[PDB]
């Protein structure tokens, strides 16, 4: 079990598994019971997030692709960038987080190296 770890979503603990059988490596969260599911495409994931063993809180997150071809402010008068859609997850182990954090990155660079 390398590219797959039990990740939490919406307060529920499911199963995070990277679909490396398709063109663009994806990330599919399949609940433990099978009542909750979620899909994530690393192709859009601009950045990755993971709480190292140094962090008492074990939780992972992925930054999705936004759009820097519009630009705007925060309604106050500060030119900022549209918040990128990210998927926040929660892990319950030190090794589990490493399984995804170390595996996801494998897909991350998969786009940078090519791009």
């Amino acid at each position: 079990p390398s590219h797959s770890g039990a990740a939490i979503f919406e307060k529920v603990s499911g199963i995070i598994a990277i679909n490396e059988d398709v063109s663009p490596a994806e990330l599919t969260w399949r609940s433990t019971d099978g009542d909750k599911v979620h899909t994530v495409v690393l192709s859009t994931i601009d950045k990755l997030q993971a709480t190292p063993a140094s962090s008492e809180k074990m939780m992972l997150r992925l930054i999705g692709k936004v759009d820097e071809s519009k630009k705007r402010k925060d309604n106050e008068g500060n030119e900022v960038v549209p918040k990128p859609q990210r998927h926040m997850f929660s892990f319950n182990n030190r090794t589990v987080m490493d399984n995804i954090k170390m595996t996801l990155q494998q897909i991350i660079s998969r786009y940078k190296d090519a791009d």
Binding site: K47, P52, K112
Partner: peptide, 15 residues
Amino acid sequence: YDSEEFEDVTDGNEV
């Protein structure tokens, strides 16, 4: 300040 309870990872291009 969500960095104290979360670390950063290799992000896309910037500079």
